[PDB]
């Protein structure tokens, strides 16, 4: 419970730091490659 509230608050920010950084990661791949065109 308290241990489960540890893993809940850990994972809720873990996919936040994973996906939304990856959201900007291929966004900058678009930005570098649009400058190529």
């Amino acid at each position: 419970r308290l241990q489960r509230k540890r893993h809940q608050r850990a994972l809720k920010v873990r996919n936040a730091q994973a996906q939304r950084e990856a959201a900007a990661e291929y966004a900058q791949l678009l930005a570098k490659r649009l400058s190529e065109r």
Partner: protein, 228 residues
């Protein structure tokens, strides 16, 4: 049970119907007839199931435990027998053909794009024939072009435009896969956009636009089509 399965009439009354998946059902193929009926590799469906559960085979980089996964054009099949790697290919004589590929050409897969559309939050995407969706594509690709997929990510390594002069394999229609794969393109009444193909035996014959499969260049194409 049609003839592109390349299965004998003996040993089976009800052919295994393919399940729902990333391909049209007519050129679909379950992995059970790929192993125990064309590779002659298993003997019963129960060990075909045991092949899938013990995860020594995989398709397109995913383990994909299903008896009736439909298999499309030149899918990458990964097996663990002397680290061998397999790819399908189409034959002129109305059948299927799988052959050994090494791992460098197994890393990519050259696939035709189906449609292109601007998506959510203003981003563009593109879809292929195998259901794989690639976003932020090349803006210079059009309908009936092709793309290489990474097999680790879904992005682009290589791409060529549809044109008149380069190797554009044929798939579907009254014909099914003649080697030589190019003359040119023109229009027609009713739609049904005319694509002509000239073989190595130098005969020209017309097809449709949905059968476009740009496989490479004269000399070197990107696919490892074997020797007959």
């Amino acid at each position: 049970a049609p003839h592109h399965w390349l299965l004998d009439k003996l040993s089976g009354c009800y052919a295994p119907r393919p399940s729902a998946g990333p391909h049209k059902l007519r050129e679909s193929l379950p992995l059970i007839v790929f192993l125990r009926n064309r590779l002659k590799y298993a003997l019963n469906g129960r060990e075909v199931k045991a092949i899938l559960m013990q995860r020594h085979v995989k398709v397109d980089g995913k383990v994909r435990t299903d008896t009736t996964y439909p298999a499309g054009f030149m899918d990458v099949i990964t097996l663990d027998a002397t680290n061998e790697n397999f790819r399908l290919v189409y034959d002129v004589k109305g059948r299927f053909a799988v052959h050994r590929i090494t791992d460098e050409e197994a890393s990519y897969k050259l696939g035709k794009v189906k449609k292109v559309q601007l998506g959510k939050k203003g981003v563009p995407y593109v879809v292929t024939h195998d259901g794989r969706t690639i976003r932020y594509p090349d803006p210079n690709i059009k309908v009936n072009d092709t793309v290489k997929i990474d097999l680790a990510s879904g992005k682009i390594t290589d791409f060529i435009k549809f044109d008149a002069g380069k190797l554009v394999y044929v798939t579907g229609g009254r014909n099914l896969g003649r080697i030589g794969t190019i003359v040119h393109k023109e229009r027609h009444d009713g739609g049904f956009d005319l694509v002509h193909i000239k073989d190595s035996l130098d005969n020209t014959f017309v097809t449709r636009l949905n059968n476009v499969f740009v496989i490479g260049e004269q000399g070197k194409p990107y696919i490892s089509l074997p020797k007959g």
